Copies of this chain bind each other. A is one copy, B any other.
Amino acid sequence: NSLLDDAKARLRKYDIGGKYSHLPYNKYSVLLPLVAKEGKLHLLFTVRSEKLRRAPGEVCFPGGKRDPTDMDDAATALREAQEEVGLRPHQVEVVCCLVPCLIDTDTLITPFVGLIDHNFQAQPNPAEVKDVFLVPLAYFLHPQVHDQHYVTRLGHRFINHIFEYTNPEDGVTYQIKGMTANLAVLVAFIILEKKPTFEVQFNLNDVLASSEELFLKVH
């Protein structure tokens, strides 16, 4: 079995399908894209352009607002990823839908995890993406540069991470934070099963149940 075949195996146990579809919120989807490169797994990220209303300049996963013409939440993740980085449908296999996050009182973000084909080459769309980059999956469990702080908001205490990663190939440094960082850490732990060198939001011995309770406590 390949690196991505092993990931699919661990991710399947956490797929909750459509359990949290049809909820009365404004809907956004994101796609977490897993890439095998040089003998290990990485996650692909985007940097949003300045001209966007929502979250300009921020580091995020590919994705966006659910359009009235999209058939469902998964279709949104796939279309937005094609528009932002050139990913075609045959180049990604969606293997997991995760418990969603509420960024607002009104806004629900639904996350999908996708296995990315090895012959895919990113093509950033400069209309809405300033940059596209990779980070090794293991970095989110054993980082060289990382800080974190509690923020009760609201109520219940969440954890704000800030990861800093420098790509040795081209010398550019990126910061990954907020909901994007929470998701990277969760999926990294699911796939690699190593305890992080820091405290996390969820229960390491009870990942799925604690994840749902967390959402319900804000829903």
Contact = CB atoms under 8 A, between A and B. Distances in A.
B127 A84 contact: yes
A127 B128 CA distance: 6
12 contacts: A1-B172, A2-B173, A36-B169, A36-B170, A36-B171, A37-B170, A53-B56, A71-B94, A84-B127, A90-B126, A127-B127, A128-B128
Contact of A168 (B39, B75, B83): B39
B121 A121 contact: yes
Contacts of A65: 50-51
Interface string A161-178: 000000011111100000
A82 interface: yes
A32 B135 CA distance: 30
Given A69-B93, A90-B126, A119-B124, A169 B64 contact: no
Interface in A74-108: 74-75, 78-79, 82-84, 88-90, 93-94
Given A84-B127, A90-B83, A127-B127, A37 B72 contact: no
A60 interface: no
